[PDB]
């Protein structure tokens, strides 16, 4: 089970579970990702965040 | 408060009284390149206050039948001041930006502007009308300079991509009823730690009027639009003689 | 040595990226909480301000009276692997007995995935991608029958000598990877790594590769990204004489181990050219369907 | 030496099959990944972003394609007049095709969740008015007048220093998921209607324009989910792309 | 050589043997020869109910 | 007895595939290995050895093939004259083809690292002089004169009891790796230029020769690396080798 | 690489055979099951009516 | 003149920054360079001819018959390795026949 | 897992990881080598080594 660390997703925060039979790590299966989202990075990219209950402009 | 703001950097200052907060591109501030991500070996230069300042490029007129304009970065600054000198003398380049758009009118004027930042904004051609011709945009269209360029088909943004989905990009609205300015802060966007400042353009800035300007006869008919911008955390490397283009 | 206050207290050199947002796990859809009526002044979640550039954040519980729903709907199917790890056609190579396209029994196919709309529209939703690949070669005659023929596929990285004929010396493949397979066999399948000199493939490149005067002849350089030129794929029929059957080869690509950056609007016009976002100027059509009036369905 | 028995399903090529394949290049190590901003991990992140909705999809010629992005309001006779109507299906043909949410939902057969619509008023500062925005749950025909339309879910919008309002389309359905319906007998998964009625009037003083335009923006909520990935309906190619 | 394709509701139905829907960028498909053993695939529960 | 299902990719022969094969000779034991000096474990060991660089690749006939290995210096008018120019691509056609580093890099598409060039002066003991050796980073045209050429990376060379000097070509690039460029639009991975200018003069006393020759040696540094092994461009066979 | 020997009974399709097949749709999750009354687990339950 | 490569580095000649180099050297090893298959011999079995008219042939084993392999293997003077031979057979038109 | 010790790289300083199914050890895969270099043996084969900062001939 000693193989090269040469997949496209090495040096990433999330870890997969995959099956490999060769010494090169990019030959493995796609596997399962981890379910994490950051919707604010596109939906609410403001400097000073404001609460729902108030008026955005005051 | 929130409607009033003052932006100061270097030896310049911008005040406003009808702000609408500040948009930070992709929720990230501009930053320098780290030692684990840099690939070139020579020591880069960081001129600091002499290049990180607000530059006012030009003024455009908003009319009832205007279609829109776009500007390319950092092509607008490749020939302005110390920043332009450094960009000409050096091979590599890395920086973010802070964009401020000025447009003011009265309480009896109406209209809306969409100000957006689209990275790698490649401009497509009309392909000779019928579409059997293999044309490419000329120099004045791909790299208009600091004078900008006018859109011909704003519904497709001259690339076959709908404007209704341009809001997925970092953006702000200029609605004359509410605000009179917009600010977007863009970090460095690229797949390379450093890139050429003359061959490569990182992003493009779009200003398209979605709601037409309208006012009653007698009010002021000349409504200008102004672009102001400041590089942030600039680096340069690979020093040689200057090259014009 | 730093002695002046403006250098001692300077903030130059901060290489860490200040992140305003953080990622939170979300295996299922969000639950709904119980809500009741509210009759008060000063606190209004219905009114927003779209000028700021932020999506409105009023929820169900703040606008209407709702019940409690324990949402257990998974979000697993919309991930990048689940969306992209499906095979699709990207290229065809034709090997006719007589013709002008490939008359010699060999062909060279430059590897690019912008040749077919189904795959191109999916891949061009983003600006940068970094992934692994899985190629499959399905070969058959124009009538679709399978015949006893031996073929050779060769991967030619950029800088290697391209074969010029069926008897070229490049087919000795002392270093290039190659595949010998028969048409009676199952399709050939190989795995390809990430090969870019950069950290990602970019499908849009606003620039030129070289300096100089940008005249008419030196105009096609716009949008041409050298980092997406991944070489050539060469095919031939093994033998010293001409083959007996005309063959057609279809190539299917399946992505895996995917990462993507910078989403952009989807294409709404018909494609015309490869690596070229041109569109038919005189035949612009709306994104969607139309109706007679705004007050009727 | 180890006895085996081949089962049905050998020698076939399934396009969606997750498998292992032989690597062409041994010991190859890729270029390291630098930090690139704006990374996407799930399509639901992109589904929650406001994009312009084309309620006014009447015009078709190129010289007038741009006013499909907004619709007008003007002074009326104060009798609860009707302004516009549109349906609430995101993946169906109609107004929703101009949104990123609609384009992405065109790739999935089944969806579930509540939607949101935001309207931005772009009149002069001196113009006031009120409007009634109604959502009619599935099963009912189009309301004939404002009195009938109030009986659904609705919000009263008042023009002021806040230009925008949010209309939330709640998830009201008999099934946990909605398959994609279209013309014919499959419309049993209809979503409902949205209509905008005048509440009082569009009042303007002397010296300000008589007509103002409204821009609508659409998105999905945090309980929205999609399922059963498929190919999109429209193919953007007529011949050979070359 | 045959091709089977699974078309979920809402997808474009092929209209001819040279239709563009056969690019199967998203639809699952099976390429198999008659000389091979029969094709066998597993299908989940797909009802909205 | 154990049920199995054959997958796509059976019965194919992949030349680079790492596999197991049946041994023809059972229980065969090889000849023991004695200690042989000069063992190689990595090509980067051979890439760090100085070999002569052919800056003067003008001559082509057999009677004059040997002066491609050096180029001359002589007394001038003291105006900063130009001596020679060459590019910095090791795997590209040109001067670098005569080096072991260049020949080995012809086998790999992508490289990364800094290079080094060493110049050896073979004049008489009584001859003095100074020279300016410049490296122009990518993007700029060829310098027109010494004043323009000094603006790049350069070293001032002084003749003395030490015959040689080292010019180090630093790794200045936008990408982590450089693919192999050639004539056409792929030159966007250009490396730069090296030019040698007179600094003062080539001064010689009475009784010593007026012309002296210079030999250049090339190698790579300790951060040099190669990638994506491929076949070499030139094939050293015209017919059947027999 | 692992030596194997095919046994009699390969390439046949037995209708009652309990086996494993490749799934067409990856990561597909079905609609949750609500409580429906009157569930049958064995035919002998129906035989006693 | 001594016969040694010059050992001046980057840090001694120009002003440099700190780069954390993480580029692997795994691909230039002897196995990575040489463990690739290539053509070394051809045997022809014609129906009529003067080369192999009887339906049998003898091929003396030597790998200096083809330039691609010969140039790679002759970079060195001594080698000690194991081998893996593969025999691909077809007719001149390239079809596969029951023989 | 009892096999002959008859590969070409026996009696060597470096160790590999390989896969074998037969009793002869030369039938295994190529595997992964160890990453060690001795560049001085070709680049600096002098008797008395000299520092970078000084003059090689004094
Ligand atoms: C013997 C093996 C033969 C099979 C050769 C297949 C190798 C494929 C090369 C890598 C493909 C990379 C995927 C696409 C990369 C670029 O972005 C595209 N060219 C876009 O134009
Ligand atoms: C039934 C098995 C038939 C296959 C026979 C293949 C055996 C090959 C014999 C060993 C080859 C050794 C590799 C080359 C050794 C010598 O250096 C070359 N002849 C160089 O001329």
Q: Which of A19, A18, A31, A24 is nearest to A4 (CA)?
A: A24
Q: Which residues contact C79 (CB under 8 A, 6 or more apart)?
A: A33, A35, D41, D42, D43, G27
- Any bridge partners for residue B92, and if so which? B237
For β-strands F2-4 and D39-40, DSSP reports them as unpaired
Report how far apart the first and last C-alpha atoms of chain G are (Å, whole number): 60
Concatenated DSSP letters for A32-55? B---EE-THHHH--BSS---TTS-
User: CB–CB of G2 and I19 under 8 A?
Assistant: no
Q: Give the DSSP H/E element, type plus range, for residue D4.
A: strand D2-6
Torsion of CA C23, C24, C29, C32, to 10 degrees: -120
Structure tokens at C85: 């790890």
Which of A47, A54, A56, A58 has the highest number of chain B CBs within 10 A, making it the mutation to test binding with B?
Answer: A47
Whose alpha carbon is nearest atom 16 of ligand 1? C228
Query: Cα of H43 to ligand 2 centre, how many Å?
Result: 15
Ligand 1 atom closest to C231 (CA): 9
Mutate to test the interface with F, among D31, D32, D33, D35 (most CBs of F within 10 A): D31
The β-bridge relationship of strands B23-24 and B181-186 is: parallel
Q: Which fold has domain B5-239?
A: Jelly Rolls (2.60.120)
Residue A56, burial from CB neighbour count under 10 angstroms (0-12, 13-18, 19+): buried
- For chain F, how many helices (H) and strands (E)? 3, 13
Sequential DSSP letters for D60-96: -SGGGGGGGG-EEEE---SS--EEEEEE--SSSSSGG
Distance from CA of B37 to the nearest CA of H (A): 8
| Ligand 1 within 6 A of CB of C176 | no
Closest C-alpha among B72, B102, B111 to residue B224: B102
Sheet holding B69-73, edge to edge: B149-150, B69-73, B203-214, B110-119, B171-175
Residue pair C134/C189 in contact (Cβ under 8 Å)? The answer is yes
Going across the sheet that includes C150-156, the strands are: C106-110, C232-237, C150-156, C178-182, F13-14
Can you tell me whether residue H68 is helix, strand or coil? Answer: helix
Q: Are F88 and F192 in contact (CB under 8 A)?
A: yes
What are the residues facing F136 on neighbouring strands? F193
Name which of A27, A6, A28 is nearest A19 in CA terms.
Answer: A28
* Nearest CB partner across the interface for G32, out of C72, C77, C82: C72
Distance from C-alpha of D53 to C-alpha of D68, rounded to nearest angstrom: 9
DSSP single-letter state for residue C120: H
Chain C residues within an 8 Å CB radius of B20: 49, 51-53
| Residue I26 at interface with chain H, using a CB cutoff of 8 Å | yes
Mind telling me how many Å the CA of C6 is from chain D's nearest CA? 30
* Tally of CA atoms within 13 A in the half-sphere of B20 that contains its CB: 30
Residues of chain C contacting G26 with CB distance shorter than 8 Å:
82, 85
Structure token digits, residue C8: 């001692």
Minimal CA separation from G3 to chain I, in Å: 8
Beta bridge partners of B62: B223
* Pairing state between β C247-261 and C178-182: unpaired
Name which of D108, D68, D70 is nearest D220 in CA terms. D108
| Annotated resolution, angstroms | 3.1
CB B9 within 8 A of CB B54: yes
Q: Distance (Å, rounded) from C-alpha C271 to C-alpha B160? A: 9
> Could you tell me what percentage of chain H is helix, strand and coil, using 3-state DSSP and rounding each to the nearest 5?
20, 5, 80
Does any CB of chain B come closer than 8 Å to the CB of residue H8? no
For residue I21, give the chain G residue with the closest CA. G2
How far apart CA C237 and CA C167 sit, in angstroms, is 10
Token pair 């998964």: residue = D189
Instruction: Determine contact: G10 vs chain D, CB below 8 A.
Output: yes
What is the pairing mode between strands B92-102 and B181-186? antiparallel
G1 touches chain D (CB under 8 A): no
For F18, which residue in chain G has the nearest alpha carbon?
G1
B vs F: CB pairs below 8 A: 57
Residues with Cβ within 8 Å of residue A50, at least 6 apart in sequence: A56
CB contact under 8 A, F170 and H16: yes
Q: Which of left, alpha, beta for G3 (phi over 0: left; psi -120 to 50: alpha)?
A: beta
Q: Closest Cα to residue C135, out of C115, C153, C160, C114?
A: C153
3-state helix, strand, coil in chain B (%, to 5): 10, 40, 50
- Please tell me the residue having the least CA distance from ligand 1 atom 19: C112
Residues of I in contact with F49 (CB under 8 A): 42-43
Closest-CA residue of D relative to B192 is D34
The backbone torsions φ and ψ at residue D148, rounded to the nearest 5 degrees and listed phi first, read -75, -35
Residue D149: cis peptide before it, omega within 30 degrees of 0: no
C196 touches chain D (CB under 8 A): yes
**Gap from CA of C191 to ligand 1 centroid (Å):** 10
Which technique was the structure solved with, according to the deposited record? Answer: cryo-EM
Closest by alpha carbon to B184, among B12, B19, B17? B19
Which of D7, D11, D12 is the closest to F3 by Cβ? D7
Å from CA of D232 to ligand 1 middle: 25
Q: How far apart are CA D115 and CA D91, in angstroms?
A: 12
F172 and B40 in contact by Cβ < 8 A? Answer: yes
Helix (H) or strand (E) holding B89: helix B81-89
Question: Which atom of ligand 1 lies nearest, measured to the CA of C201?
Answer: 17
Q: How far is CA H65 from CA B224, F103, F240, H34, in A?
A: 78, 21, 8, 17
Instruction: Name the token pair of H52.
Output: 């192999």
Ligand 1 atom at minimal distance to the Cα of residue F14? 1
Ligand 2 close to Cβ of residue H61 (< 6 A): yes
Atom of ligand 2 nearest to the CA of H61: 19
User: Is B178 within 8 Å of chain A by CB?
Assistant: yes
Q: Where are the domains of chain A?
A: 1-58
- CA of G4: which chain I residue's CA is closest? I21
C173/C161 Cα distance (integer angstroms)? 11
Tell me if I42 sits within 8 A of H1, measured CB to CB.
no
For a ligand 1 pocket test, name from C155, C198, C230, C258 the mutation site with the most ligand atoms within 8 angstroms of its C-beta.
C230
Residue with tokens 């060195």: H76
Secondary structure percentages of chain G, helix, strand, coil, to 5? 10, 10, 80
Beta bridge partners, C94, equal C248
Alpha-carbon span F200 to F158, nearest angstrom: 10
Which of E:13-42 have CB within 8 Å of D? 20-21, 24-33, 36-41
CA of I35 to nearest chain H CA: how many angstroms apart? 7
Considering only CB atoms, which chain G residues are within 8 Å of I19? 1
User: Hey, are the CB atoms on H4 and I44 less than 8 Å from each other?
Assistant: yes
- Atom number, ligand 2, closest to the C-alpha of residue F24: 2
- How would DSSP label each residue in B133-182? S-----HHHH---TT-EE-S-TTTTTTT--GGGGGGSSEEEEETTT-SEE
Q: Which two tokens stand for residue D235?
A: 């193919």
From D21's Cα to the closest Cα of chain F, the distance in A is 7
First to last CA, chain B: 45
Six token digits for residue B21: 């907060």
């Amino acid at each position: 089970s000693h193989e090269n660390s040469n997949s496209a997703t090495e040096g990433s925060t999330i870890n997969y579970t995959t099956i490999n039979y060769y010494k090169d790590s990019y030959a493995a299966t796609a596997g399962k990702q981890s379910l994490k989202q950051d919707p604010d990075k596109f939906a609410n990219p403001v400097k000073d965040i404001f609460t729902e209950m108030a008026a955005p402009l005051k | 408060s929130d409607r009033v703001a003052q932006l100061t950097i270097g030896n310049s200052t911008i005040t406003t009284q009808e702000a609408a907060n500040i948009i930070v591109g992709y929720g990230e501030w501009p930053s320098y390149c780290s030692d684990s991500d840099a690939t070139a070996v020579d020591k880069p230069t960081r001129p600091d206050v002499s290049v990180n300042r607000f530059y006012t490029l030009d003024t455009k007129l908003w009319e009832k039948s205007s279609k829109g304009w776009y500007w390319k970065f950092p092509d607008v600054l490749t020939e302005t001041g110390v920043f332009g000198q450094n960009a000409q003398f050096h091979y590599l380049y890395r920086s973010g930006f802070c964009i401020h758009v000025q447009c003011n009118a009265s309480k009896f004027h109406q209209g809306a502007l969409l100000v957006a930042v689209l990275p790698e904004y490649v401009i497509g051609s009309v392909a000779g009308g019928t579409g059997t011709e293999d044309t490419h945009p000329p120099y004045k269209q791909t790299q208009p300079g600091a004078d900008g360029f006018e859109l011909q088909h704003p519904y497709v943004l001259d690339a076959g991509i709908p404007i209704s989905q341009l809001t997925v990009c970092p953006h702000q609205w200029i609605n004359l009823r509410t605000n009179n300015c917009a600010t977007i802060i863009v970090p460095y966007i690229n797949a390379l730690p450093f890139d050429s400042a003359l061959n490569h353009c990182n992003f493009g800035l779009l200003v398209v009027p979605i709601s037409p300007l309208d006012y009653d006869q007698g009010a002021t008919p000349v409504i200008p639009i102004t672009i102001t911008l400041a590089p942030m955390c600039s680096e340069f490397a690979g020093l040689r003689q200057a090259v014009t283009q | 040595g730093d002695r002046v206050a403006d250098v001692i207290e300077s903030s130059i050199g901060d290489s860490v990226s200040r992140a305003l947002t953080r990622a939170l796990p979300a295996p299922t859809g969000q639950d709904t909480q119980v809500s009741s009526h509210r009759l008060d002044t000063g606190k209004v979640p219905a009114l927003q301000a779209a000028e700021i550039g932020a999506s409105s954040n009023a929820s169900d519980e703040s606008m209407i009276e709702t019940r409690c729903v324990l949402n257990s709907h998974s979000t697993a199917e919309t991930t990048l692997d689940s969306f992209f790890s499906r095979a699709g056609l990207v290229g065809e190579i034709d090997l006719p007995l007589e013709g002008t396209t490939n008359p010699n029994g060999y062909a060279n196919w430059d590897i690019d995935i912008t040749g077919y709309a189904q795959m191109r529209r999916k891949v061009e939703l983003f600006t940068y991608m970094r992934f692994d690949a899985e190629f499959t070669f399905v070969a058959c005659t124009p009538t679709g029958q399978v015949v006893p023929q031996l073929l050779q596929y060769m991967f030619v990285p950029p800088g290697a000598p391209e074969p010029d004929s069926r008897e070229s010396l490049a087919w000795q493949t002392a270093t290039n990877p190659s595949v010998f397979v028969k048409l009676s066999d199952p399709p050939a399948q190989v795995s390809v790594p990430f090969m870019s000199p950069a950290s990602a493939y970019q499908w849009f490149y606003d620039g030129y590769p070289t300096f100089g005067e940008h005249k008419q002849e030196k105009d096609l350089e716009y949008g041409a990204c050298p980092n997406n030129m991944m070489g050539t794929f060469s095919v031939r029929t093994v033998g010293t004489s001409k083959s007996k059957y005309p063959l057609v080869i279809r190539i299917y690509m399946r992505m895996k181990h995917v990462r993507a950056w910078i989403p952009r609007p989807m294409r709404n016009q018909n494609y015309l050219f490869k690596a070229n976002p041109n569109y038919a100027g005189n035949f612009i059509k709306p994104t969607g369907a139309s109706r007679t009036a705004i007050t009727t369905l | 030496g180890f006895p085996t028995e081949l089962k049905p399903g050998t020698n076939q090529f399934l396009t969606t099959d997750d498998g292992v394949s032989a690597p062409i290049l041994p010991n190859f190590h890729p270029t390291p990944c630098i930090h690139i901003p704006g990374e996407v991990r799930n399509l639901l992140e992109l589904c929650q972003v406001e994009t312009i909705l084309e309620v006014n999809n009447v015009p078709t010629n190129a010289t007038s394609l741009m006013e499909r992005l907004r619709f007008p309001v003007s002074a009326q006779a104060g009798k609860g007049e009707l302004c516009a109507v549109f349906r609430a299906d995101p993946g169906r043909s109609g107004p929703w095709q101009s949104t990123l949410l609609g384009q992405l939902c065109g790739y999935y057969t089944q969806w579930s969740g509540s939607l949101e619509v935001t309207f931005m008023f772009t009149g002069s500062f001196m113009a006031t008015g009120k409007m009634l925005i109604a959502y009619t749950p599935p099963g009912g025909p189009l309301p004939k007048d404002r009195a009938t339309a109030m009986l659904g879910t609705h919000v009263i919008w008042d023009f002021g220093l806040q230009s925008s309002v949010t209309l939330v389309i709640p998830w009201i359905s008999n099934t946990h998921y909605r398959a994609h319906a279209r013309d014919g007998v499959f419309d049993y998964y209809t979503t409902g209607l949205v209509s905008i009625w005048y509440q009082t009037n569009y009042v303007v003083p002397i010296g300000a324009p008589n007509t103002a335009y409204i821009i609508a923006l659409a998105a999905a909520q945090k309980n929205f989910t999609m399922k059963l990935c498929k190919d999109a309906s429209d193919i953007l190619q007529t011949g050979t792309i070359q």
